[PDB]
């Protein structure tokens, strides 16, 4: 048995599992299946540990997984993340979004700006207004207006209703649909669908 | 898009990933690649969470993974396991070994008896003789002899040298070779090897 060739076959299969789990993560995020998203996320994270060298395409795939993971935890309150990252899940999603090797088109700016406002608004929704001000300081006349809204706990201001959570999710979901179409034809899902269609 | 058929394709692919990760877990255990075993174990555990209904063959596969996992942690000292299971990894491997749907042949008895003695000997090797006596009580003139050996801290007694750790590992490795031959032809590894052979 050639250990080198076995390790190569295992790397090929890890690459296939990564695409399959990204495809599944995208669908669960689109569908709102939280528990399924959490399980697929755990599987993708474990499979990714089995890879030590990634191609440009594989790096793009893992960063999309990390990005959707932070967006899904935007409203969740976990100190462990605040202990290590020292920022909020949505601020962490913003850092990933701005460094993915992808086109900075109109949809990229829309998603970026919605995450920027929602990183502040989710803290206000949770009643943590000191945190909302800290998030504002780390990200940013516009600044004066936005700071007055936070100071006045004006959570339901028309600005927040235009730059809403639902609007952020809809725009991110539209981007996820493009990822889903690109990967819908990857090896593992395509072979899995052919078995189900044969039955 | 039919959600039911997509979920079925995902179940088919989870089944393939399970066989692939079992195959990889078996090879890492056989080869002594500890870090690779730990990563494959984490991947198999995550993939298994994505399955809610398992066939008789799939249950056999997950129990082989659990069995090898306990054997690998036989000498490791972790209270969390002792907190939940309240037993030692090797006693836990013994419970799994005796309930896998498999033939109770000569090799099954050999492995069982080697695990039984090694669950005691690994505690003596770690200097925990009170624990070795507690393990002995939970598992078991033979008992009087074995208890005298533990009481006298006679770790290197000829009985322990015949029922050694190395002998336990060699017998378990021979069983793992049979598992490896049965699964060496599963879909994911077979398709992965064909890609590497083509290059
Ligand atoms: O980025 S992380 O903080 C590293 C620990 C898991 N986090 C999210 C994640 C989800 C899915 C795949 C992945 F590589 C990473
Ligand atoms: O049996 S456990 O205590 C459940 C938590 C993980 N443990 C070992 C394991 C390894 C690999 C696959 C599996 F299903 C289980």
Swiss-Prot record, chains A, B:
Cysteine disulfide links: none
Positions of region (TRFH mediates dimerization): 1-199
Effect of residue 13 to D: Abolishes dimerization and telomere binding
Transmembrane segments: none
Consequence when changing residue 16 to P: Abolishes telomere binding
Superkingdom of this protein's organism: Eukaryota
Phosphoserine, modified sites: 151
Tissue specificity field: Highly expressed and ubiquitous. Isoform Pin2 predominates.
Comment text on domains: The acidic N-terminal domain binds to the ankyrin repeats of TNKS1 and TNKS2. The C-terminal domain binds microtubules. The TRFH dimerization region mediates the interaction with TINF2.
Purpose: Binds the telomeric double-stranded 5'-TTAGGG-3' repeat and negatively regulates telomere length. Involved in the regulation of the mitotic spindle. Component of the shelterin complex (telosome) that is involved in the regulation of telomere length and protection. Shelterin associates with arrays of double-stranded 5'-TTAGGG-3' repeats added by telomerase and protects chromosome ends; without its protective activity, telomeres are no longer hidden from the DNA damage surveillance and chromosome ends are inappropriately processed by DNA repair pathways.
Protein name as it appears in the record: Telomeric repeat-binding factor 1
Organism: Homo sapiens
Lineage, broadest ranks: Eukaryota, Metazoa, Chordata, Craniata, Vertebrata
């Amino acid at each position: 048995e050639d250990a080198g060739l076995v390790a190569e076959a295992e790397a090929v299969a890890a690459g296939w599992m990564l695409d399959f789990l990204c495809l599944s993560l995208c669908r669960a995020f689109r569908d709102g299946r939280s528990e399924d998203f959490r399980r697929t996320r755990n599987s993708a994270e474990a499979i990714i540990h089995g890879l030590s060298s990634l191609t440009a395409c594989q790096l793009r795939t893992i960063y999309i997984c990390q990005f959707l993971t932070r967006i899904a935890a935007g409203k969740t309150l976990d100190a462990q993340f605040e202990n290590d990252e020292r920022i909020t899940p949505l601020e962490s999603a913003l850092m990933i979004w701005g460094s993915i090797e992808k086109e900075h088109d109109k949809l990229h700016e829309e998603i970026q700006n919605l995450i920027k406002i929602q990183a502040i608004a989710v803290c206000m929704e949770n009643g943590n207004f000191k945190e909302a001000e800290e998030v504002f300081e780390r990200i940013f006349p516009f600044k004066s207006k936005l700071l007055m809204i936070i100071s006045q706990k004006d959570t339901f201001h028309s600005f927040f209703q235009h730059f809403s959570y639902n609007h952020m999710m809809e725009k991110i979901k539209s981007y996820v649909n493009y990822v889903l179409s690109e990967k819908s034809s990857t090896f593992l899902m395509k072979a899995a669908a052919k078995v189900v269609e044969s039955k």
